[PDB]
Write a protein that binds this ligand. Structure first.
Ligand SMILES: CCC[C@H](CC)Oc1ccc(C(=O)OC)cc1NC(=O)c1nnn(-c2cc(OC)ccc2OC)c1C
Ligand SMILES: CCC[C@H](CC)Oc1ccc(C(=O)OC)cc1NC(=O)c1nnn(-c2cc(OC)ccc2OC)c1C
Lengths: 285, 286
């Protein structure tokens, strides 16, 4: 079995996930909706390539049973139509991740600078891990309560590394304990930009990784997924590569079409404490 | 061929239609839309049967090419979700019909009370005739510019739609493949109905209706192949007779819905009887 500290470690992470992951997205309100220069022109071409890779239709299910469905247009600024909404979704998700990190005892004891640096480097990764738990691989749809995001028209989709990540991770059929441990391992990455206490974060990540390794051996005897632990660690390595690629994508689009919310601006590159006033405020409550 | 008086009649009606029928619905703006979220029971039960008869989805195409689609909920008060939009659409269509009648010389010379009585009796029918020209029978969709109203997919399929006499009328009328001139002549024959409630100059209106009918009869004889269009005029007049029965049915349906859930605009209230025609008098005086 697991040690007393290992079981309590999983118990704390699971309680954190329940307190801070709004799976029904019931409290995601007041969001935006679509339809509701030579140096600049050159940067547009690359931004158009970034936006056509992830094209989803939007579905809004009302309490009465009615459904409002948004089908995106074909490629001007029309390819930016979903950005103000996705910014509000990302910002809403990031607030839940910030709250997730705050209740973890190992994260709360860290200096405020390292708390800022770890959340900055892992925000995208923990959000994709949370999005994968509501991803329907049969329909290609992220089901976020009354909101749904359906991929628009497979081997072309799998070429997109972010979409391939969600299909591959969903195929592993992970439990909630394995997702929340993946979030812990990703959150406590010691080699994030700006981390000071490099060794103590490295030591915390090793305890979360050993706990995941021990959990799988004690709760997963089915050969359904052999080497599940090493497969998970490979997905986290791939998730770090996708994080760098898509963080560059957002900066390119933000350069010619500003959409990032004030919380996202601190999350990207738009003295550590002074440059992250909102993150510092949220991390105090 | 047609006589000069009959050609001038068709020419006046086509100009009336061109000036007053916004076929692209470009000037239908600021309309409302469904949100993003013992004896009283007998009124409700009949109204639930009344509102389940016509089930459409709403489609709004944006200028950039995007498409917002609204699928109505399944049968509370949610079965009313489309009423404010339909009240806006109907009010807009009725104004175009009033303007249509207002430029017809034979209509303006009638007494003002007969003008109001003819409009109240024919508003639904001229609205349905205009809607039929933008009805796509292959997709079951009224294409109104950037707005589209599509019959919802049902387990009964196409035969299910034919249960509603209103829908059967649109498919049957579209099957005739009528010209623009025949549509505008149908509207004139419907508008000048001498047996509407409250009509005083019964003989004058009846004589005006027969001239429009004779003109339509002569148009079909002179501009359509003799063999297969031998009874098109009689088929059209039978469609107008059936459209009048559907008018009586759906007017009663609207009054029942209004009795338990008010939705009619001020102009619609004057149209269904819900000084009595203050807005109608102003519109006819402009
Ligand atoms: C709700 C389900 C969304 C789906 C799930 C994978 O995926 C999309 C589908 C479609 C689109 C799209 O059609 O848009 C126009 C965009 C995204 N996805 C992000 O918009 C996005 N997901 N994560 N992040 C992000 C978050 C960060 O902090 C938390 C930091 C950086 C980030 O990105 C570099 C973003 C902007
Ligand atoms: C959008 C147009 C296409 C289709 C053709 C039948 O229309 C509907 C589609 C769906 C519905 C519906 O799903 O309902 C909840 C209702 C209507 N249609 C009227 O709502 C309506 N059409 N004509 N009139 C009306 C107008 C009058 O003066 C102009 C006078 C009386 C009238 O009716 C008694 C109404 C209220």
């Amino acid at each position: 079995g697991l040690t007393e500290e290992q079981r309590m470690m999983i118990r704390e992470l699971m309680d954190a996930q329940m307190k801070t992951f709004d799976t029904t997205f019931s409290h995601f309100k007041n969001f935006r909706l679509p339809g509701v220069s030579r140096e600049e022109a050159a940067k547009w071409s690359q931004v158009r390539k970034d936006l056509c890779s992830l094209k989803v239709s939007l579905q809004l299910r009302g309490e009465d049973g009615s459904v409002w469905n948004y089908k995106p247009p074909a490629d001007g600024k029309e390819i930016f139509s979903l950005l103000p909404h996705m910014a509000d979704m990302s910002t809403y998700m990031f607030k839940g991740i910030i709250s997730f990190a705050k209740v973890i005892s190992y994260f709360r004891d860290l200096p405020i600078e390292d708390q800022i640096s770890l959340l900055k480097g892992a925000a995208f990764e923990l959000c994709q891990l949370r999005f994968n738990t509501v991803f329907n691989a049969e329909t290609g749809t992220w089901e976020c309560g009354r909101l749904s995001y359906c991929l628009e028209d497979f081997q072309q989709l799998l070429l997109e590394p972010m979409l391939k990540f969600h299909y591959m991770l969903k195929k592993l059929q992970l439990h909630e304990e394995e997702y929340v441990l993946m979030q812990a391992i990703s959150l406590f990455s010691p080699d994030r930009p700006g981390v000071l206490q490099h060794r103590v974060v490295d030591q915390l990540q090793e305890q979360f990784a050993i706990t995941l390794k021990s959990y799988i051996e004690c709760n997963r005897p089915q050969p359904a997924h052999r080497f599940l632990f090493l497969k998970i660690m490979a997905m986290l390595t791939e998730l770090r590569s996708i994080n760098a690629q898509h963080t560059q994508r957002l900066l390119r689009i933000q350069d010619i079409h500003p959409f990032a919310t004030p919380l996202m601006q601190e999350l990207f590159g738009i003295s550590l404490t002074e440059r992250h006033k909102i993150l510092h405020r949220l991390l105090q409550e």
